[PDB]
Amino acid sequence: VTGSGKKPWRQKGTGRARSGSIKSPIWRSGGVTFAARPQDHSQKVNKKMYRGALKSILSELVRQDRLIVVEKFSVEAPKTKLLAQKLKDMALEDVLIITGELDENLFLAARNLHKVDVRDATGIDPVSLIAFDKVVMTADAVKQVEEMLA
Amino acid sequence: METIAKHRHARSSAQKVRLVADLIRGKKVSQALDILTYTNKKAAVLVKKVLESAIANAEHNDGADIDDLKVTKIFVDEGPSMKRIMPRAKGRADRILKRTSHITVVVSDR
């Protein structure tokens, strides 16, 4: 805290409770007692625990029937209207669509729908898999996921 | 019909003005004006001005007659106080509260 190290008043004889610095955490405009600093909040997950968590999440998705497997999933042109029409045809609203190959047209189409996300095979994560209501797997994505999970 | 006149931030203390207000509380307006004429207090002067204003309000704004008016309510509240310094012996400073008060007079017939 900006201030000086001068004792505010002499130790004895003033009649006031003794003080030694204007920057005391008791005082108004004094410092914080245990002031927080930039700290690293990340935690370690063992690789086998991460893989077990993904396997359990995928097994539960199959068990509650929130995982739809399709053979091919693409759009002709990057039109969000076209993608929204195709998802309303499939009767899906809140959907995570995993695709084996990163498709520019599909990514540009789904960039603006906030309940629809499009992911590549290698970039799935437990929070997204749990949070999104339906998950749509292409066959190539199924192969890649089962390969990386072993 | 109750008619109200207030004098706010009056440069006087609430205790002294309460002495005068409690002197005239509940009387008829003519008796109150005689009492406030012949009371020797600065608060009596202030309260008399408020009371005459209240009577004029009851005439002009609501048509009430003087001969029916009584002082139904009168009360003095504490207003904000100006803080001053009085320098004392041996470097000590003392604070002076130059007190104010709000004087309210309610006159009516019933």
Binding site: G13, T14 | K90, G91
Partner: peptide, 16 residues
């Protein structure tokens, strides 16, 4: 500051 009867010595040292 301080009172003179607290700085004084004859009345402060009253019971040695």
């Amino acid at each position: 500051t301080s009172k003179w009867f607290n700085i004084d010595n004859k009345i402060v040292d009253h019971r040695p």
